[PDB]
């Protein structure tokens, strides 16, 4: 290893008197250096000194084996050994610094002058053998608990002196670095407990379902194709189909796919001498519950597009025979005024152009889509003309990255053109249900995904699913490009925010 | 020593897989004083503050019989001493007594659960994955268990609760009896404890009476000298009656044991069935004298519709209520009088009331153009006609927040009622009108003023006569503020009113009572 | 008989020694020793000033302090290069009393994790303690031990430690005819005890906690008003003016969290930015509808603030100057004057909380203009009223609370400026007051000060002469108090500098100012 200005740290000798048990680990695990999650970097000649290359915390999460083992224990203590591997040759120059930051040091940005005031080592990019460091358990408690995250010693690596090299004309030269680790001889677990499947160290996974068998999250229809189209706007403001990976629902997106583009309301019918009868809807929750306006633009599932649509309602009439029917209505949602539509407050209006009297009763109805006229990809009007709390736009994307969109075709009544009508979404509803039910723990910023064919095995592309709930692709084309709908998405690993993808 | 040993005796099979744990030796260099406990306390096992339980043949495998957290609250001595310290540390010894009849059969499991294990979900699969002990219910000798202080700090704080080792007992195998005669026995289990050698407290602090351990006590008053919580009358009877509805929705007299006041119940017993309002009068050649009342709090503060169905102390039944109101008349010869008004609080009908904007009406039948002035007044009940034990409409067809109905009850369990009789007008019936409550106002004020800390789920009480010092029955008071007891008969049962209720211990819901 | 029991024994505190570095060394990375001469001198604590008055009642807490590096200026300065600390201290108390004064205080050692409610006078003597007369001429000293459950303490976390609490055991009374305004002064000093050190050597960082608050060296005459874009012209106190105003601008905590619609930049006050849409058909006039956004270009979202940052918080009619693009023959862009209404108005829809503003001009022609983004700045005020305007239709919007909760005899210091008013009758200037001027709103939220007490004692002193003009209390909520019992308004010269003395408790009694 190296001489670092620090004292030895006691592990199990400090924890043993108040531990019920001290548990030993498979001795073959002390003989292998394994790659750490989020432990890689690339240095380029364009990078400037002071960039953080990595920042890692001590704990069972650095080692996949120890992470799996910690599901059947109450606590852990002790230190680790770490290796940094750099890939340069003899014609490079530049320097890197790795320092040991103590558990309670404030979070923020460090300069090159401050990084040298920690216990640290400084390494040239021409180094041949791996650089060996200790990671010690500096703490104020006797042992750590496995199922919560505490403060611990950190390992921070920052570019110190810039890389100076030549390059060919075709590819820029980079210096790659990787960090590996293993437990030291003083490492232990504490108390054998019944294993738990839902652990903070649990990798995210996706349902094994091809997108052609999923459901669209904005319109009640099957997914008919996945694609990318740079010509269309890049940062929409869709209020349905938005979910965090940790399982937080954004906007008005519901859990179930039967709530999309629908609402439940108390309906009062009043015949008017002019156009005809008018039905007033007082909105409530779809499952049956009071609707109080708040942080949401509308009750969950409310349509989030602009246009004129028609709805079908279960209606009970009083005539000379015929208790109940199912009639249609007309509803306006666009920026045309003429109705005072305020879905945010919870009042809507509808009507039908009819003669004679059509008196009915108020009977706890539910409304469903029929068709759309003049549909446009723009936010509806949740107030009279006012503003509402709503979800942020989708993005931002790194330069050379573009959104991947799941597309379906909705019903049309326009007489102008007859080509198609396509509405897109960020994720199908099955992914929404999956993320909302599993409640994963997020590690850094984004997950490297992988689309491949079921039985042939051919890789199609690699993409990035951001924590916000949208998938980005590194594309540089100009015309729309579609993909086969018969593959399966698989999760590879967590990646940092600035991670360039392989192109199409 | 004893008669037939067709039983198990000693369950000396422990070999519990656990290392010894250090106690006060780790804490001494970080405490600023030298403290020690009276050595005689380390000498005998005493019953725990929540050390009674029961196993019945109706219990199913997986049911939790007890779970005790390590700390000063397992010992009455240590619980009383903990009021003068900030801090404890150390181990404990527990004795389990379950020595059931030779005709029974069954098994329990006792496990050592470490700190930070999630509470709630604990199944028959997971219990044996812990260091544990298997016990027969016939076992003659007391079973001895260690409770270790597994921790990652140096000592614990007496006030507030931290994570410590738990001792959990599951029913492993159902309890069944082999005897030919018509009945299955019940096993009555006891828990005793004492501190281990290196147990200690840390820093001497002023002894505060209101502390988390303490103990819930009740006032020493006979029920016949108490006041009713639903009608201003003395308590006249103690009754149980299975025929009456078992889950009523009374809004008065409802108090949580920890102290929280529920429903519309007041602290004082003079607010019950009374109300304060701003009165405005008018005269009509039809109905007569019509008074509109805008209700305000009976202490003179204004009333705002919030999380209560009505202002504090409002009547919570249906009927026609004759009330007396003080009125001032400008006509010569009289200045101040008391008048009787009629109040309609029954079912909704074709009536003219608008409580929505806070105007609630009363009527008086007369012909002469009575002259009266508006003001403020407090109205108290005088009589009831057509009484019905049912909640009145508060928002007139719109739901209002209400206290939950009283319940649930274990099978065979029935509510115990404090009964009083009210003045009423009857057209042709000579009987007295009876109204019941769950707890008299004295207990409501006691719990409101004392602010106790609950421990498990319920309290076991014993009712004892003062004339002979002889116990009448045992009952369960739930944390929700109602008392239940085990009765399987048909006709009503009445009890003497000159006894005293005494607190015995903390018990869980599934505790099986002896039948009365 | 046998023994003699003396009647007069000197006071002392019995202890059992508490281990410091011996407990912590095996799990600390380093154990770092401090300069040995720091162990030899008592030095005033940063929170080390308090007062006793005959208006205080027994059982009032005169002070309380937490063990840690923040009790000593040398230790507070050293703690910026370490991550932790362990060990014990000693504290010294000095009181400036008289032969007139009768009273007793008790100083007690309250352990960590004792419940924080309210101790009474009988319970305070059950802790280890010292009893002190207010007539004492010499200092009194006590030990502060590191009773704890952890191995060491993090420096940047306050955590829970041993406390030192002093309360009034017996009432303060003078034989004088009274009642007078005699105040007993008290000061606290400290030093580390033998077992004390730090834990892990880190880069020295100046923006840490235990960094004493300071103030910019700028005279008030060279500052900016925080509610109107004008230089500050007056410094005054007025008991006749209302005592608890509800200003939404100019509010900031000492820790730097902004309240209300306070902006960082000094060019944002009383201005707004919006997209404008202009309409006129035959006789309505050129009516402009503004959809507001944040002044930096960011979209406005209705949230925890009553309006976009920098919005006016005074009622009246505002006349503003706005750049507009015309398309008539000749001329492309000009600057026009517009009228708008801030306060309540029947039949009018003004909800800047929701982002909708309406303005009008009187036009003798069409003078049609294209739509786009504009920035509107104030130009004139008509009917200026100092009150909260109509933020919503009829609803309650999130607002900053009123100033409050001054002690008896305590009034609010005001920074005064003059606006550009258009009226027809009175030529008197109209004045607007602020609690803290700009350059004080900045210098907050750029420094993350940790307060460690309830009020700051300041000293106003001229630079040319050095004489003290007045002393005041700066509350954590971001306003200043003075002890002024007079009736008429009083003003002060505006060429002084505010100087930070120390941290004080809320009950601290200021010396009276003026007559």
Residue numbers in the entry:
A (entry chain C): 27 to 530
B (entry chain B): 15 to 530
C (entry chain A): 18 to 532
Study text:
Fig. 8A and B show that, indeed, apo D348E is in the activated state where the P domain is resting on the shell. The loops in apo D348E are in the same conformation as the wt under activating conditions, but far more disordered. When the aspartate is replaced with a glutamate in the modeled structure, it is too large and collides with T343 and T344. However, in the activated conformation of apo D348E, the D348E side chain rotates up, and there is more than enough space to accommodate the larger side chain. In addition, this orientation places the acidic side chain in an electrostatically favorable location, adjacent to K351 and K345. Therefore, D348E could cause a push/pull structural change where the clashes caused by the mutation push the C’D’ loop out of the wt apo conformation, while simultaneously being pulled toward the activated state conformation because of favorable electrostatic interactions with adjacent lysine residues. Movement in the C’D’ loop is then anticipated to cause a domino effect in the P domain, leading to closed A’B’ and E’F’ loops at the tip of the P domain, a structural conformation which is resistant to neutralization by all three mAbs.
The T=3 icosahedral calicivirus capsid is composed of 180 copies of VP1 with a molecular weight of ~58 kDa, which is divided into the N-terminus (N), the shell (S) and the C-terminal protruding (P) domain (1–5). At conditions found in the gut (i.e., low pH with high metal ion and bile salt concentrations), the P domain rotates and drops onto the shell with intra P domain changes that enhance receptor interactions while blocking antibody binding.
